[PDB]
Amino acid sequence: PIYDPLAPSVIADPYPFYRKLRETNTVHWHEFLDSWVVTGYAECRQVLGDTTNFGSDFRRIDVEIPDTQLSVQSLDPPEHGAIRHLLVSALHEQPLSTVRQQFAAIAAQHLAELSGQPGTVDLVSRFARPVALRTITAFLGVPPPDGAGFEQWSNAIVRSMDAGIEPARAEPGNQARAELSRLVTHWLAEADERGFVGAARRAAVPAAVLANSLRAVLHAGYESVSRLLGGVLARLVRHPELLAGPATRDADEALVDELIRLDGPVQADARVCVRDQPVGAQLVRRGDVLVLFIAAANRDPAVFPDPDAVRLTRRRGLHLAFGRGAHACLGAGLATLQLREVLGALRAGGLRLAPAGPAAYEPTATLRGLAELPVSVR
Ligand code: HEM
Ligand code: NA
């Protein structure tokens, strides 16, 4: 193989490896994984937006998928539209003034808990994860579960996304998916009318699709926000000058766009080819699996010159960290609002967060995440 996606040196910093792949071929056949690896921006953008020839529902290539496992992320048009519009409608019903107030208060509270800490603190377990958990459960309108236990179940699902590389990772993910399903079932039965769960219940599609899709909102919301915050904090702690900018709404728009482009946690996004189709110069055939390395696409220098740097003058609307097309991230607006509020809380907190040891990364290849981010607080 080109490299081991779970090798420690790759996990420590995968972007040079992505770049070597991209420089050799933006659409490369990985024979041991039996998949195309797509690292070019143009090709990833093409595949994401074409659900006619590239799908997320493996039933379209004659794979058996029981009805009880269907979900918004594994359905394609036309079945995808009903549950997708249901979720968007429930999202759009949430008043943004309240959402922003909740997100800002959570971020400020967890930062204030850090003030007065004289030793080394781990920003993953002390900020990124608890903020994400309270953020997603406030949005859902449900009581937060225990943070440590919830992180353990959720982590099993994240690791299972790499089961094609390490098959032993599949089984813990399935047990964990079942646990999160029971959690979601309890919320469906008991949640207040305030919040996203109450709105989704009102809008309601097969009950299995709704429950699995809400589980997806919970897990995707928690893990994506948690891991984005960890990566962004890692960059801010090494480059505090990023927070020393104008700090106006528009200046922070550009900064947030760059932070999501660079530190968006989704490294890989898979599709199946339903009908033979060229991708770049290559012919992809019905039945082929494609892994879109969207974090690599977000460092493609043909689109992002000096790709590894924060540059505040790039054209907006280019990065693929939220996907593109029918399956584009449901929470992209919530996530940008949330990160804006974190930046604002950091600036108002007046706290200096200096490195107290290296950023340490977890052996997760699909969804990048820090295992630990040790800092001193001054
Ligand atoms: C509260 C925050 C979030 C929620 C509630 C959320 C929820 C979701 C949901 C439900 C989907 C599936 C959409 C569909 O298949 O139609 C999705 C897709 C996606 N999310 Fe988010 N997400 C959140 C934050 C984030 C963040 C912070 C990132 C990355 C920075 C992200 C990256 C993505 C990507 C790349 C996809 C597309 C996957 C694909 O191509 O199928 N999400 N998200
Ligand atoms: Na084992």
Side-chain angles (χ1 to χ4, degrees):
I2 308 90
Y3 70 75
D4 178 6
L6 289 179
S9 53
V10 173
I11 291 292
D13 184 10
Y15 298 96
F17 294 90
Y18 299 159
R19 180 174 50 82
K20 295 199 186 56
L21 279 172
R22 194 188 314 105
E23 292 170 354
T24 305
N25 193 335
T26 52
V27 183
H28 169 86
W29 178 248
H30 200 300
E31 56 266 46
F32 303 112
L33 297 180
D34 199 55
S35 310
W36 298 100
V37 172
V38 185
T39 52
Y41 176 93
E43 293 85 350
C44 285
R45 183 174 187 151
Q46 174 199 348
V47 178
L48 289 168
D50 179 4
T51 58
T52 301
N53 297 303
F54 306 101
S56 304
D57 179 0
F58 288 60
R59 297 179 301 174
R60 299 172 67 193
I61 61 172
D62 298 322
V63 177
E64 181 61 37
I65 303 281
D67 298 327
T68 57
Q69 299 181 8
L70 298 177
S71 190
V72 62
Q73 72 267 43
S74 58
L75 290 168
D76 285 322
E79 190 165 4
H80 174 256
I83 178 64
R84 171 80 178 196
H85 189 237
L86 186 162
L87 297 173
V88 168
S89 295
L91 165 68
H92 284 174
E93 275 193 25
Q94 308 309 304
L96 277 174
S97 58
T98 301
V99 172
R100 177 173 300 187
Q101 290 168 337
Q102 289 176 325
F103 289 11
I106 291 169
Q109 287 166 6
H110 287 276
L111 194 61
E113 293 190 325
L114 296 187
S115 50
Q117 293 298 349
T120 303
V121 307
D122 163 42
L123 292 181
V124 172
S125 61
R126 300 279 289 274
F127 187 87
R129 291 176 183 165
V131 166
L133 182 58
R134 292 184 62 209
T135 293
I136 191 60
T137 55
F139 172 74
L140 294 173
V142 302
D146 177 71
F150 187 83
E151 168 65 24
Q152 289 179 298
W153 292 109
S154 184
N155 190 251
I157 300 175
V158 173
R159 277 168 192 260
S160 76
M161 300 173 182
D162 304 320
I165 301 162
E166 276 188 8
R169 294 181 172 210
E171 178 55 20
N174 295 328
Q175 304 173 290
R177 277 183 185 91
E179 199 65 41
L180 262 59
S181 290
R182 295 179 180 93
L183 195 58
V184 165
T185 295
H186 180 250
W187 290 345
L188 279 170
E190 304 293 346
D192 186 62
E193 291 295 320
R194 190 203 85 84
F196 184 82
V197 173
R201 180 175 57 209
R202 291 193 299 276
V205 177
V209 173
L210 185 72
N212 292 337
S213 296
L214 288 178
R215 186 173 50 260
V217 169
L218 165 69
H219 187 255
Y222 170 68
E223 286 292 353
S224 301
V225 173
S226 166
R227 289 163 186 272
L228 176 64
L229 291 178
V232 168
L233 289 168
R235 186 175 303 276
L236 294 175
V237 300
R238 319 243 131 60
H239 299 93
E241 61 271 24
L242 288 168
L243 288 170
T248 66
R249 196 114 90 172
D250 291 327
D252 280 354
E253 177 199 316
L255 175 60
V256 165
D257 197 62
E258 280 295 88
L259 294 170
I260 291 171
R261 179 182 67 82
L262 289 160
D263 296 318
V266 180
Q267 307 296 292
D269 191 357
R271 293 290 188 277
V272 294
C273 179
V274 178
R275 299 180 172 96
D276 294 8
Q277 189 71 359
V279 182
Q282 167 61 50
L283 179 60
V284 179
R285 300 172 178 284
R286 171 171 170 82
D288 289 356
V289 175
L290 306 87
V291 184
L292 309 180
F293 281 25
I294 52 177
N298 286 334
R299 311 285 186 106
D300 188 332
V303 180
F304 305 104
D306 200 4
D308 297 335
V310 171
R311 179 179 296 181
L312 299 170
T313 53
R314 301 187 194 275
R315 179 164 152 242
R316 193 81 53 264
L318 293 181
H319 76 67
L320 304 179
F322 292 123
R324 185 184 91 89
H327 286 278
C329 174
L330 172 83
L334 291 169
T336 61
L337 174 58
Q338 198 277 337
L339 186 56
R340 276 185 182 265
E341 296 304 322
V342 171
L343 295 180
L346 285 169
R347 289 197 193 96
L351 296 176
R352 296 293 175 82
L353 302 176
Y361 289 85
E362 186 188 4
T364 52
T366 298
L367 219 55
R368 185 156 182 73
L370 283 293
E372 179 189 313
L373 185 55
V375 308
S376 60
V377 186
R378 300 288 176 266

